[PDB]
């Protein structure tokens with residue numbers, strides 16, 4: 617199997633057990649097994665993750681290695697039947713706990729959006745479509761840092777073929793043009809950011825109480841989802857939302873132009889996120 621040796625060609629040699637010490641488990645679910653650890657020489661804390669389809673793996677590592685960014689969970693090293701991937705450790709945990717257990721004000725939401733847009737602006741400029749933007753794939757630093765991960769469903773595009781048409785991602789966060797198997801581009805990430813902002817407002821994406829297929833159909837025949845309580849939001853927030861969740865892909869904002877939106881100007885410092893992190897940690901204890 618050529619692929620299996622293409623993977624072994626990527627990862628480096630050396631013994632993992634010898635470079636890091638004090639390993640402690642913190643994750644084991646629909647992925648593999650995630651542990652925490654520390655660098656012996658510098659004292660840096662790291663996160664180390666440990667069939668089916670070993671291609672998502674290859675592209676993950678490859679795409680992560682050549683797309684380093686302050687707003688992306690940094691890939692560090694890799695070792696080898698289960699792969700050992702060493703990554704930047706963010707102690708604040710996932711955005712999901714924050715959106716489901718806490719109320720976020722517009723300044724806090726704007727700050728997260730801005731950090732995410734900056735990640736997206738970087739990826740889209742390097743011809744990378746994430747395709748799986750959701751609060752679950754946003755990690756938080758104990759200092760308030762906001763970073764993106766999960767490049768297992770991404771698509772590297774080119775001027776010759778700048779569109780995809782496959783149904784990938786997570787249903788509730790998928791743009792209509794992805795759901796309808798049309799020719800789509802990087803702006804699908806923008807749609808998904810918009811749905812994530814709806815998470816930050818309401819606690820969950822639209823249609824979450826429905827089954828994934830019903831949600832797929834609902835997205836297909838509703839287009840732009842409605843807020844339960846639009847009146848709660850400022851006019852500038854609602855406008856930012858409308859341009860993320862625009863049906864017309866041409867009218868929908870890019871990461872670049874959305875970064876200039878007046879809504880992001882009311883963003884709080886990322887330190888305003890640490891009380892949300894503490895609340896989420898308390899809430900899920």
Ligand SMILES: C[C@H](Nc1nccc(Nc2cc(C3CC3)[nH]n2)n1)c1ccc2[nH]ccc2n1
Nearest residue numbers: 643650663703704705706709710752753765766
């Ligand atoms: C299983 C893990 N749970 C966790 N709990 C406390 C803190 C924490 N921080 C981390 C995780 C990492 C690298 C494994 C992505 N860096 N920092 N992660 C986790 C949580 C959410 C996720 N979204 C997409 C991957 C992923 N993984």
